[PDB]
Amino acid sequence: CDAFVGTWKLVSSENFDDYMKEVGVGFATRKVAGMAKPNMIISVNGDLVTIRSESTFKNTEISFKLGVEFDEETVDGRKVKSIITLDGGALVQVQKWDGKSTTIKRKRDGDKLVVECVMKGVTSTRVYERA
Numbered sequence: 001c002d003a004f005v006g007t008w009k010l011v012s013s014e015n016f017d018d019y020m021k022e023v024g025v026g027f028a029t030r031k032v033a034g035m036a037k038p039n040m041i042i043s044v045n046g047d048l049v050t051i052r053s054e055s056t057f058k059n060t061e062i063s064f065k066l067g068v069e070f071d072e073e074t075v076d077g078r079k080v081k082s083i084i085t086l087d088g089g090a091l092v093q094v095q096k097w098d099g100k101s102t103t104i105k106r107k108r109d110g111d112k113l114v115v116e117c118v119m120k121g122v123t124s125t126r127v128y129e130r131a
């Protein structure tokens, strides 16, 4: 997960609003949340990985052990159970809440960090470049 370490900047987003809507995010949040060009800061300390997202709207931060389920309060306000594992070079995150589930995969693609989100078939792709 050292290949993910660093600060990243959003450079392109595709279908993110559709994803949020499939997730159930409210109109206001979707608008403000989508307005953003958040920075993602990933760091590793021992077996604890931290993924931070910063923007003018809201900052988020989760610290976890890969493979151990934990509580996460998403940027849109959901309180979910997340599990993040390292598979094939990608960080695969699954969030579960109110009987629903969504997958967020973070992978390295060339010199970029690509975030793919999936909810009920609706998928969004966000590309980040080193800040």
Ligand SMILES: CCCCCCCC/C=C\CCCCCCCC(=O)O
Residues within 6 Å of the ligand: 020, 025, 029, 030, 032, 033, 036, 037, 038, 053, 054, 055, 056, 057, 058, 074, 075, 076, 104, 115, 117, 126
């Ligand atoms: C309202 C969105 C809820 C889902 C948030 C998780 C998005 C994961 C995918 C790509 C990283 C996007 C940047 C992090 C979200 C913060 C957005 C913000 O408020 O600036």
